[PDB]
Every structure is written in C-alpha cells, then in structure tokens.
Amino acid sequence: ETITVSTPIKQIFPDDAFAETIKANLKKKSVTDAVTQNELNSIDQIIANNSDIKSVQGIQYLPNVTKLFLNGNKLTDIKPLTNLKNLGWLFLDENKIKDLSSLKDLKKLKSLSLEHNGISDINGLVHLPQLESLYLGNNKITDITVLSRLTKLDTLSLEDNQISDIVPLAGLTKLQNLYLSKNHISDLRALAGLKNLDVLELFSQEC
Ligand SMILES: [Ca+2]
C-alpha cells in the first residue's frame, strides 16, 4: 500500500538491517528520519547483499522496484514481494526461502536467482512463463518437470542438485547457457534439439 503522512523509516521497515538499507538508498541520515510516499516511490532498486536482513516487511510500499539484490541474507518469508508488479530482476541466493507462492504474480520478472536456499520443490515457478534466466544451483531439486513451461529461458543453472531426468528441458529451444554439473544425469538425449546452446556444463555427474 502507501503511507499518507510522513513516517519514520524504522516504523515502516521493522527489520533494522533493511531499515538501514532504505535509509542509505534515500540518502537519509537516520532510520529514525521521516519519509513520505513520494520518497518511497523513488526506489526502483535495492542493493543489499549479505546485509543480515531477516525480513523485507515494508517493501510493499515501494511500487516502482524493478531490481532487488538480496543475496546472502537471512530471509525465509517473501510474501511482502507479492504485489511488486514491476519486479524484473530478483536475486535471493544464500537465504532459506522455500515458499515460492509469493512470486506467482510477478509477471514482469525476467531473472530469478534462488541458489543455496535448500529448495527441493520448484512447482511454483509454473507461474513465471516469461522468465529469461533462472539460477537454482546448489539446492535439493530432483524433479524439474515444471521447467518445460518456461519456454522463454535462454539461461538456466541447475548445477549441484539431485537431478536425473532432464527430458523437461527438451523443448526449451531458446536455451543458450545451461549449467548442469554436479547432478545424476546419464541420458543426454534431451539436449539433441537445443539448437542455440553455446555454454553447456555437464561434468561431475554421479550415476
Ligand atoms: Ca526494528
């Protein structure tokens, strides 16, 4: 939603680490300083890697965010992201995010990164058919059936997981970069029809 009157940053963003991020973004002197919606409207990018952030509550008030870099934090819940309709790039590596339902309405999302989140179920990704690049390296994924729906992907990383069957990738003709090292892949027939592959990594398979 939005704030109708000047309000302290610390009152909108509960997480003190995140509050500091917003303060820095708006070039404010303190998280205790007051901010207006006009000021919150100015944020289209948040860079806060390894910032010890546990919650992004309050981010719902930033309607124009398109880029969000939150790698290496302590996130678990991303429900606050649900209505950030303009999100185009979302990097959330090194967190503990598993509920991907909050991403279902991010129809402008082109790049998503969720490496090292201990994820095994990615069926919620079906709601992002427009995705162009997806990074899911270092997780516990085995079933990638849902990926057959992501026909716009040109870059995909699934390295360091527990995948055996890559047939779901057979129809992703736009793929140019495919990272599949450190998995359990034996059958590579699914790669036959991928006419645009430039980069392909398949080393260290354990069968
Ligand atoms: Ca606080």
Q: 120 CA distance to ligand 1 centroid (A)?
A: 32
The per-residue b/e assignment along 107-146, b for 16 or more CB within 10 angstroms, e otherwise, is: eebbbbbbbbbebeebebbebbeebbbbbbbbbebeebeb
Q: 52 CA distance to ligand 1 centroid (A)?
A: 13
Class (C level, CATH) for 1-207: alpha beta
Q: Under DSSP, is residue 199 helix (H, G, I), strand (E, B) or coil?
A: strand
Q: 138 CA distance to ligand 1 centroid (A)?
A: 32
| Contact by Cβ (8 Å): 169, 147 | yes
Retrieve residue 132's tokens: 């162009």
| Contact by Cβ (8 Å): 71, 93 | yes
**Is the torsion defined by CA of 36, 42, 48, 53 positive or negative?**
positive
Retrieve residue 204's tokens: 């260290």
Q: 9 CA distance to ligand 1 centroid (A)?
A: 10
Sequential DSSP letters for 1-20: ---SS-EEHHHH--SHHHHH
92: closest CA among 42, 141, 51?
51
Single-letter amino acid, residue 109: L
| Contact by Cβ (8 Å): 180, 163 | yes
Checking phi first, is residue 202 left (phi over 0); if not, alpha (psi -120 to 50) or beta?
alpha
Q: 39 CA distance to ligand 1 centroid (A)?
A: 20
The rounded distance, in Å, linking the Cα atoms of 20 and 48 is 10
The rounded distance, in Å, linking the Cα atoms of 45 and 10 is 19
> Torsion angle of alpha carbons 138, 127, 178, 158, nearest 10°?
20
Retrieve residue 193's tokens: 């029809």
Q: 31 CA distance to ligand 1 centroid (A)?
A: 10
How far is C-alpha 139 from the chain's CA centre?
14
Q: Which residues surround ligand 1, an ion (CB under 5 A)?
A: 14, 16
**Reported structure resolution in angstroms:** 2.0
Q: 6 CA distance to ligand 1 centroid (A)?
A: 18
| Contact by Cβ (8 Å): 151, 129 | yes
Element (H or E) spanning 24, and its range? Answer: helix 16-25
Q: 158 CA distance to ligand 1 centroid (A)?
A: 36
Retrieve residue 135's tokens: 């990074």
Q: 101 CA distance to ligand 1 centroid (A)?
A: 26
Q: 14 CA distance to ligand 1 centroid (A)?
A: 4
Q: Under DSSP, is residue 124 helix (H, G, I), strand (E, B) or coil?
A: helix
| Contact by Cβ (8 Å): 21, 46 | yes
Q: 28 CA distance to ligand 1 centroid (A)?
A: 17
The rounded distance, in Å, linking the Cα atoms of 175 and 200 is 10
| Contact by Cβ (8 Å): 69, 90 | no
Locus of tokens 């736009």: 174
Single-letter amino acid, residue 200: L
The rounded distance, in Å, linking the Cα atoms of 47 and 45 is 7
- Segments making up each domain of the chain, as ranges: 1-207
